Amino acid sequence: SMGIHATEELKEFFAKARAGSVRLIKVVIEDEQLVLGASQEPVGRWDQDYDRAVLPLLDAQQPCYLLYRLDSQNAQGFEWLFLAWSPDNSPVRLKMLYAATRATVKKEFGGGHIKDELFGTVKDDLSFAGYQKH
Numbered sequence: 620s621m622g623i624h625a626t627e628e629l630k631e632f633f634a635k636a637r638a639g640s641v642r643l644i645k646v647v648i649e650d651e652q653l654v655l656g657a658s659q660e661p662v663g664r665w666d667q668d669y670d671r672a673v674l675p676l677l678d679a680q681q682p683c684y685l686l687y688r689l690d691s692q693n694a695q696g697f698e699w700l701f702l703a704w705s706p707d708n709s710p711v712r713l714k715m716l717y718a719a720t721r722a723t724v725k726k727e728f729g730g731g732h733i734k735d736e737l738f739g740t741v742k743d744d745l746s747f748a749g750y751q752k753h
């Protein structure tokens with residue numbers, strides 16, 4: 620369809636991530652496709668990994684999405700946080716592209732694996748401190 624789609628490589632990576640060994644997935648839009656921007660393995664607990672994983676990957680003038688893995692599992696696997704980043708300094712065109720495509724990222728990943736959803740426009744919003752206030 621007309622909307623931005625996840626590449627088959629990104630979908631495959633999603634499945635790999637849910638098997639384990641992935642703490643963070645950064646999804647970005649490149650050439651009208653959703654693709655893998657970055658990924659990181661777990662180091663310690665989900666709370667210990669959080670800020671050092673999330674904060675450095677947030678650009679002051681580009682939106683992105685992060686899938687951040689908790690240590691808990693529900694009955695359909697690891698639980699994830701779905702973090703939407705959209706700083707005001709982003710070009711309006713990018714803000715709307717990312718806003719328009721958010722639901723697609725969640726749908727492709729599988730909403731049933733997502734424990735919670737957060738949004739930020741300043742890094743503090745999506746920091747561990749932000750998550751604890753949510």
Ligand SMILES: [Zn+2]
Nearest residue numbers: 620621622624
């Ligand atoms: Zn299409």
Ligand SMILES: [Zn+2]
Nearest residue numbers: 692693698734
């Ligand atoms: Zn749960």
Ligand SMILES: [Zn+2]
Nearest residue numbers: 735736737753
């Ligand atoms: Zn929530």
